[PDB]
Amino acid sequence: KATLPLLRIIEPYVAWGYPNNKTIHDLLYKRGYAKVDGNRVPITDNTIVEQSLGKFNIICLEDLAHEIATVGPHFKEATNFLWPFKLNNPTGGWTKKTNHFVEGGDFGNREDQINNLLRKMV
Amino acid sequence: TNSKGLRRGTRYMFARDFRKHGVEHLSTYYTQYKRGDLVDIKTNGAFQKGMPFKAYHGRTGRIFNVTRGAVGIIVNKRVRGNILPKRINIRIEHIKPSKCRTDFLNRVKSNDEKRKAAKSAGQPVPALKRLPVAPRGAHTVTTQNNEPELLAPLRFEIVA
Amino acid sequence: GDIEKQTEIREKKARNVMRELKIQKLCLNICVGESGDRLTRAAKVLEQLTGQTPVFSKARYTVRTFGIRRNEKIAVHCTVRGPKAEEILEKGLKVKEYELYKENFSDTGNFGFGVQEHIDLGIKYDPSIGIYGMDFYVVLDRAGRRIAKRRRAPGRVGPSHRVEREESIKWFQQKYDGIILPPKPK
Amino acid sequence: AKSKNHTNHNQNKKAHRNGITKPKKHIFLSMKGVDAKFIKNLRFSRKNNKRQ
Amino acid sequence: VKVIKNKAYFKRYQVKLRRRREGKTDYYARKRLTVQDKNKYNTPKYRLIVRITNKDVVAQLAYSKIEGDVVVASAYSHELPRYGLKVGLTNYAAAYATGLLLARRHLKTIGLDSTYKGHEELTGEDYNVEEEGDRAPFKAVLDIGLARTTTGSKIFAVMKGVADGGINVPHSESRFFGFDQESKEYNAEAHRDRILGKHVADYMTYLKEEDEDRYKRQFSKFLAAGLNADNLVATYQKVHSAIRADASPAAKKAAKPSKRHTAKRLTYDERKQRVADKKALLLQLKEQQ
Amino acid sequence: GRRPARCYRYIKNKPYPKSRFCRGVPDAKIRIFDLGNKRANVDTFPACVHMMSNEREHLSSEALEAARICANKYMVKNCGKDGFHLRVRKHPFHVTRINKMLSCAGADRLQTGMRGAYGKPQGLVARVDIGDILFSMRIKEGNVKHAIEAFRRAKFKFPGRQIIVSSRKWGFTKWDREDYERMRAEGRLRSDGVGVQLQREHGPLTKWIENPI
RNA sequence: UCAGAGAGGACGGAAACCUCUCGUAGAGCAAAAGGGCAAAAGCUUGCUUGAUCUUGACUUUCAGUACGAGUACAGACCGCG
RNA sequence: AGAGGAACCUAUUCUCAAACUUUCAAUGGAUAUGAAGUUGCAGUUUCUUUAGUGAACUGU
RNA sequence: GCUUACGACCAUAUCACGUUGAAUGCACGCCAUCCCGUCCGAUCUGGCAAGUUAAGCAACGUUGAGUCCAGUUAGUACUUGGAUCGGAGACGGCCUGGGAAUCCUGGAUGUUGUAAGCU
């Protein structure tokens, strides 16, 4: 209830949905960057995750994926440790970007179809 | 341009509520006000002395002074890019205790009591944090005596 | 059935001693219409009659037709209570020959009349004073009116306890052997 | 050549450019503008409390 | 005639406060009598309620709270039989005795009677309780209600009683009996005589001389109690001494069982049944007429 | 002469009623709002036809009177003065303004331009919305055709679009004919001249007995 | 307790003055409009000069300048009760 | 605009108000959400109270 | 079950008509020497107790008016944000969220504090 109002305020400018297992793992492995001392460092090794989230028992990319997917007690730290993902334009294009998903457009809540979009964007 | 009198545009703001004119009940004067308390300001038109300015109507302030029949209040007022803590001397009739602070104080009391009880009784320290309402959990809905009702859009009828 | 008991109970209640009709006050008025010697001599007349000094009433407005200016004393009135009121009332009713109209009684149970010559009230004429007429008003009501006049917790008199024109007329007829003349041709 | 032209157009943007600064936290500590009799008694009370 | 009290009248009507409709509380004076300065916070401000009914005198000590006044002490003139007096429970002497009773009772309750004995010799002179030791005398402000403040009124007799009992009641001698409003001179002797009821005894003698039947009619129960015009003053002095000797409140009794004497409100079903019966009865009357 | 209606067609300003602030207002052209058998009993005319508006505009008092005259003339000529009741459900209360300017050569010598251009009263107009009822006619069931044709002829005096319909309500009452008949049979509807009054149950039974419902 | 209404009373009439009922303010409050007010803020009346002396704080306009106006206190001497 | 007891009274009725309103949103405004806090103990006051009665302050 | 004094909230408490009212009490009530105030002991004031629940007051009654609460009105009116949305325009719907008020219908008709007393 503290985040949904924000998602309603920013509706016309975002496409959001419910990520699934493959989506989370693809995002983390192909485009995972950590915020280390204010620097964007690619996560090419599990030690990079361990150095910053080891205090919370998160030692591997799998631990990070589990924390995100199941919304664990350290979801805030796990997600803030990640640099905002910088995705590629989808291969196939968008649809409208100026109308809601239910109007045949792009913005708003696509529910589980964010995975369909991310399979092209990531 | 408008005139700049004190009571310009307060025709309804400083008026009494419907069927609420007349003698002011005495709980207003029996209420206790201490320095550091938070009070809401709502002008009472029936009393023309110690009236707050219209800008402060409906604002909350902290008491810094307590005189015989009035209080000094520090009220935030926005002036361009700064918020000024203005000091105003308002009579008791235009003042009312603010419940927001009292609710928080009650929650603090409850938190301290719960922590003390848990520690004394050896229980693990409880969770004393407000949390946003989470999404609903999984459950089963039974249709027994509650069969689904099939709905369809209704045709247009000319309601003359 | 039950109506018989209800009616007998109501009549028994109406026979209560505290419901007795009595004269509350007699108000004597003389609107001379001007200030000065005439008003002073009217005040003397009322003093001689009642035995108590009257009070002067001033005009509320200015009427050129009546020759009246605001705040000018134009009337003198007295209020009499007790046996003196009964005595003066009997003298006035003697002047009227104990005859009154049904239209002289108000809805609230009070009744009034007028005397055109105060000599008829058994007052010796005095050349220095003259002759005046006056209005007689009689306020009738039972015991217990204090509840509507006291300062603390005043109430409203109950409808059964209130007086009516018929009861006032009956009181007049019985007490003074009064006569009710036929209505004055409208 | 009319030249009154009042407006409030670009004023909130200017106000917010450097942020809206809220009042400090020590402003409630000062005892300024408080009842003189209360202040006098406070001085007397503070001038006499034995340190140890 | 146009009906004044119509639906719009009632729809726009605003009722006064209950105690103003009842004509019992003067809120203008109440505000100034019960409201404490905000820099004194919750410190009670004590008020001496004096109220004289047709047959009784009531004196109370109270302080106001946001949920109703708190009466801390009370003395009624109908308690005076415990201290002699059986009749004349409304005159000046009875009022003064009631005030004295209240003062002594509350002082004993708060344990200040020994410190503050008050004026123990009735002289009629104005008296104010001078501070003794460290504790200042108990203070209360007079509340007369809707009564008229005339010279020699019995509300100020009760106030005088309390003041002599030893409670600080801010006052001046202007409205006491014996104070000549013209020359602004105060006759303590006259006030003492009134407090001792000499006026009642004088009336008794005057009526006895004038007409025996009127005398009996006026003072029927005084004679029945054996109070003539040559022992009333002594009786009042004995009453004062008895009050000053003992002032504790009378002991309470046991809660007698109570039964319903009034009618109980009808239930919804009963009301509906009565409506149906009345409908049937009215229809039958219509058909049979 | 009067300015063309297109100058004051659409609703642009706030309501400007005649009051202590707007004085010197000329009288409205339309004065009569009820025509025909206006004193007929409620049951005389059970059928009702409305002329609703499909435009959010200003109807001038001149147009209202013209339509009234047209409809009244046709209805009187084709049904008799006692065969119908026509009611105009729109009163002109809004005051339009005019800023008069001299229109002769050399006018600019005296012309003030737009300086102090607040106007003066010109006429009265009726503010109308989509779905608002303009004219109503209650007639017998064998005259709906004449009523509809009268409103068809009258609609040509108003600007914009109007829609003529028939109503399920009994005459000028607010009850659809079926329920009106049922309630009147039950005695819950007491005649009130043109309309009817609902007789609610609540009240003293001494009053109830005068008409048991 | 007002504005007003009703019903009564010699000359007295639509309107002078007296009396009783009703009366949420529909009156009045120096003035414009708007608020406010019913054992009063209105009306009648008693006594009075707090419309006095002194400095600070604050509100309003505001640049948080000044004048003007006002608010809540503090010290003095007073008025009414 | 009629109705029930020419005006009048009663219950209604058509249409309205930037300088009318019983009622009253959505957007909007303001304040609070702990260490500069919470519990006690143990002192000061010429303020306040009938009164450790309160108010406030102070303490390595 | 109540009465009184002082209240708090200030109509669920007001208003109209009517029935009943044990005991305390309240009240009306009798008198006018004295205090006190009046044209007037009507009000106010003082001294009392023959009489009365007649009125005040209390409880109760009324398909009672008012007031209060709820349902309905109605996901309606209105409205935040979106559209290279429809329409000549007036305007209209859709997407995304908030969301009323009359009429009408039903119910309730004071709650409670301190002190004293009756039962």
Swiss-Prot record, chain A:
Q: Which domain of life is it from?
A: Eukaryota
GO CC term (a single one): cytosolic large ribosomal subunit
Molecular function terms from GO = RNA binding; structural constituent of ribosome
Entry keyword set: Ribonucleoprotein, Ribosomal protein, RNA-binding
Tell me which family the UniProt entry assigns to this protein: Belongs to the universal ribosomal protein uL30 family.
User: From which source organism is this entry?
Assistant: Caenorhabditis elegans
> Can you name this protein?
Large ribosomal subunit protein uL30
UniProt keyword Ribosomal protein, yes or no: yes
Keyword Membrane on entry: no
Q: In Gene Ontology terms, what is a biological process of this protein?
A: maturation of LSU-rRNA from tricistronic rRNA transcript (SSU-rRNA, 5.8S rRNA, LSU-rRNA)
What is this protein's function? Binds to G-rich structures in 28S rRNA and in mRNAs. Plays a regulatory role in the translation apparatus; inhibits cell-free translation of mRNAs.
Parent-record interval covered:
123 to 244 of 244
From Swiss-Prot, chain B:
Its Gene Ontology cellular component terms are:
cytosolic large ribosomal subunit
Name of a matching Pfam family: Ribosomal_L21e
Keywords, ordered alphabetically = Ribonucleoprotein, Ribosomal protein
Q: Which domain of life is it from?
A: Eukaryota
Q: Which GO terms describe its molecular function?
A: structural constituent of ribosome
Q: Name one GO biological process term.
A: translation
**InterPro entries for the chain:** Ribosomal_eL21, Ribosomal_eL21_CS, Ribosomal_eL21_sf, Translation_prot_SH3-like_sf
Name the family: Belongs to the eukaryotic ribosomal protein eL21 family.
Family matches, as PANTHER family: 60S RIBOSOMAL PROTEIN L21
What's the name of the protein?
A: Large ribosomal subunit protein eL21
State the organism named in the record: Caenorhabditis elegans
From Swiss-Prot, chain C:
Compartments annotated for it: namely: Nucleus; Cytoplasm
The phenotype of cells or organisms lacking this gene is: RNAi-mediated knockdown results in a growth defect.
Q: Which GO terms describe its biological process?
A: translation
Give GO cellular component annotations, separated by semicolons: cytosolic large ribosomal subunit; nucleus
Which PROSITE patterns does this chain map to? RIBOSOMAL_L5 (PS00358)
Give the matching InterPro entries: Ribosomal_uL5, Ribosomal_uL5_C, Ribosomal_uL5_CS, Ribosomal_uL5_dom_sf, Ribosomal_uL5_N
Which segments does the entry list as coiled coil?
none
**Pfam families the record matches:** Ribosomal_L5, Ribosomal_L5_C
This protein's source sits in the domain of life called Eukaryota
What does the record give under GO molecular function? RNA binding; rRNA binding; structural constituent of ribosome
Which keywords does UniProt give here?
Answer: Cytoplasm, Nucleus, Ribonucleoprotein, Ribosomal protein, RNA-binding, rRNA-binding
The answer to whether keyword Cell wall biogenesis/degradation applies is no
Q: What else is known?
A: There's a functional difference between the two L11-encoding proteins in C.elegans. rpl-11.1 plays a role in the germline whereas rpl-11.2 has a somatic function.
Q: What does this protein do?
A: Component of the ribosome, a large ribonucleoprotein complex responsible for the synthesis of proteins in the cell. The small ribosomal subunit (SSU) binds messenger RNAs (mRNAs) and translates the encoded message by selecting cognate aminoacyl-transfer RNA (tRNA) molecules. The large subunit (LSU) contains the ribosomal catalytic site termed the peptidyl transferase center (PTC), which catalyzes the formation of peptide bonds, thereby polymerizing the amino acids delivered by tRNAs into a polypeptide chain.
Q: Which NCBIfam families match?
A: PRK04219.1 (NF003258)
- What assembly does the database describe for this protein? Component of the large ribosomal subunit.
The family annotation for this protein states: Belongs to the universal ribosomal protein uL5 family.
Q: What is this protein called?
A: Large ribosomal subunit protein uL5B
From Swiss-Prot, chain E:
Record key words, sorted: Cytoplasm, Nucleus, Ribonucleoprotein, Ribosomal protein, RNA-binding, rRNA-binding
According to its UniProt record, where is this protein located? Cytoplasm; Nucleus
Q: Which domain of life is it from?
A: Eukaryota
- Stretches the record annotates as Disordered: 246-270
GO terms of biological process kind? ribosomal large subunit assembly; translation
Q: Which GO terms describe its molecular function?
A: 5S rRNA binding; structural constituent of ribosome
Provide the primary localization: cytoplasm
Work out whether the entry's keyword set contains Ribosomal protein.
Answer: yes
InterPro entries with a match to the protein in the record: Rbsml_uL18_euk, Ribosomal_uL18_C_euk
Q: Does the keyword Ribonucleoprotein apply?
A: yes
Ranges of biased composition (kind: Basic residues) = 253-264
Q: Which family does it belong to?
A: Belongs to the universal ribosomal protein uL18 family.
Q: How does it assemble?
A: Component of the large ribosomal subunit (LSU).
Described function: Component of the ribosome, a large ribonucleoprotein complex responsible for the synthesis of proteins in the cell. The small ribosomal subunit (SSU) binds messenger RNAs (mRNAs) and translates the encoded message by selecting cognate aminoacyl-transfer RNA (tRNA) molecules. The large subunit (LSU) contains the ribosomal catalytic site termed the peptidyl transferase center (PTC), which catalyzes the formation of peptide bonds, thereby polymerizing the amino acids delivered by tRNAs into a polypeptide chain.
- Please report the name of this protein according to its UniProt entry: Large ribosomal subunit protein uL18
- What is the gene called? rpl-5
